[PDB]
Amino acid sequence: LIPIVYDIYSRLLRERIVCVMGPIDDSVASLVIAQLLFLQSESNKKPIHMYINSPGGVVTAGLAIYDTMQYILNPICTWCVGQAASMGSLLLAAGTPGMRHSLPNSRIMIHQPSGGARGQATDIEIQAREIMKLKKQLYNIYAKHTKQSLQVIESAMERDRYMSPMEAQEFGILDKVLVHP
Q: Among 16, 47, 75, 103, indicate the residue that binds its own copies (CB under 8 A).
A: 103
Write down the least CB distance from residue 48 to its own copies, Å: 14
d(CA 112, CA 175): 23
CA distance 92 to 90: 5
Q: Rule CB under 8 A: which of 109-148 touch its own copies?
A: 111-135, 137, 141
Scan residues 2-41 and list those touching its own copies (CB under 8 A): 2-15, 17, 19, 21-22, 26-27, 29-31, 33-35, 37-38, 41
Q: Under a CB-based contact definition with an 8 Å cutoff, are residues 20 and 28 in contact?
A: yes
Site membership for its own copies, residue 169 (CB under 8 A): no
DSSP state of 74: S
Q: Does 150 bind its own copies (CB under 8 A)?
A: no
User: What would the x/- binding string for its own copies be over residues 54 to 93, using CB under 8 A?
Assistant: -x----xx-xx-xxx-xxxx-------xxx----------
Residue 41's binding partner among Cl ion, its own copies, none (Cβ under 5 to 8 angstroms by kind) is its own copies
Minimum gap (Å) between residue 118 Cβ and Cl ion = 35
The widest CA-to-CA distance across the chain, in whole angstroms, is 56
Q: Euclidean distance between the first and final Cα of the chain, in Å?
A: 28
The CA distance from 135 to 153, in Å, is: 11
Active site residues: 86, 111
Distance of alpha carbon 58 from the chain centroid:
11
Site for Cl ion, rule CB under 5 A: 76
Ramachandran class of 16: left when φ > 0, alpha when ψ lies in -120 to 50, beta otherwise: left
Among 57, 88, 107, 156, indicate the residue that binds its own copies (CB under 8 A): 107
| Nearest approach, Cβ of residue 140 and Cl ion (Å) | 18
Report the residue from 160, 166, 170, 176 that binds its own copies according to the rule CB under 8 A: 160
| Positive or negative: CA dihedral 92, 160, 59, 113 | positive
Least distance from its own copies to the Cβ atom of residue 59, Å: 10
